[PDB]
Amino acid sequence: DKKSARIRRATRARRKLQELGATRLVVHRTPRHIYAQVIAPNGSEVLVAASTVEKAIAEQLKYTGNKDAAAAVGKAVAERALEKGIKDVSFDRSGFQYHGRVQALADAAREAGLQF
């Protein structure tokens, strides 16, 4: 289906991350936007988040959702999370390949101080 596809692509990892019980950094992408969330291991509550859909992170990006944009969100959730002392996490591509705008944001996360 496409969104259907992505999910089963996404499912194994997710599950192995739940098995392992680990606050996970969850990325999600869209033609126009890129979002990131740091989600407690219980799976049901998010500690930190950031995304190009927030007035700020955006009010100074050429375009939302592109390699550059991503980066901003990365470094965003990165700091925000570090703010709350959330260090150490596991990246969750959620079906998207680890490569695109996704790799930035990811990379930006590290270069911010996030552990993974």
Partner RNA sequence: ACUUACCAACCCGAUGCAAACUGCGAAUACCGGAGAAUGUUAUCACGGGAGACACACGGCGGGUGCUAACGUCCGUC
Partner RNA sequence: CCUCCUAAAGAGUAACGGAGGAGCACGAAGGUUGGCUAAUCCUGGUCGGACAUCAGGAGGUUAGUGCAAUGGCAUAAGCCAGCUUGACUGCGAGCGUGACGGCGCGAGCAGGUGCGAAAGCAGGUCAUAGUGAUCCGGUGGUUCUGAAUGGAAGGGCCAUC
Partner RNA sequence: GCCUGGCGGCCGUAGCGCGGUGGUCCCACCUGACCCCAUGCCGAACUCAGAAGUGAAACGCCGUAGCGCCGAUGGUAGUGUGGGGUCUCCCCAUGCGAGAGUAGGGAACUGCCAGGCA
Which stretches of the chain bind RNA, using CB under 7 A? 1-3, 5-6, 8-17, 20, 22, 26, 28-33, 35, 37, 39, 42-46, 49, 51, 53-55, 62-68, 90-91, 93-102, 106, 116
Q: Which is nearer to RNA, 5 or 111 (CB)?
A: 5
Burial of residue 90 (CB within 10 Å: 0-12, 13-18, 19+) is middle
Task: Give the pairing type, strands 46-51 and 34-39.
Answer: antiparallel
Instruction: Provide, rounded to whole angstroms, the least separation between the CB of residue 26 and RNA.
Output: 5
Which is nearer to RNA, 87 or 99 (by Cβ)?
A: 99
User: DSSP label at 11?
Assistant: H
Q: How far is the CB of 75 from RNA (least distance, A)?
A: 16
CB 112 within 8 A of CB 83: no
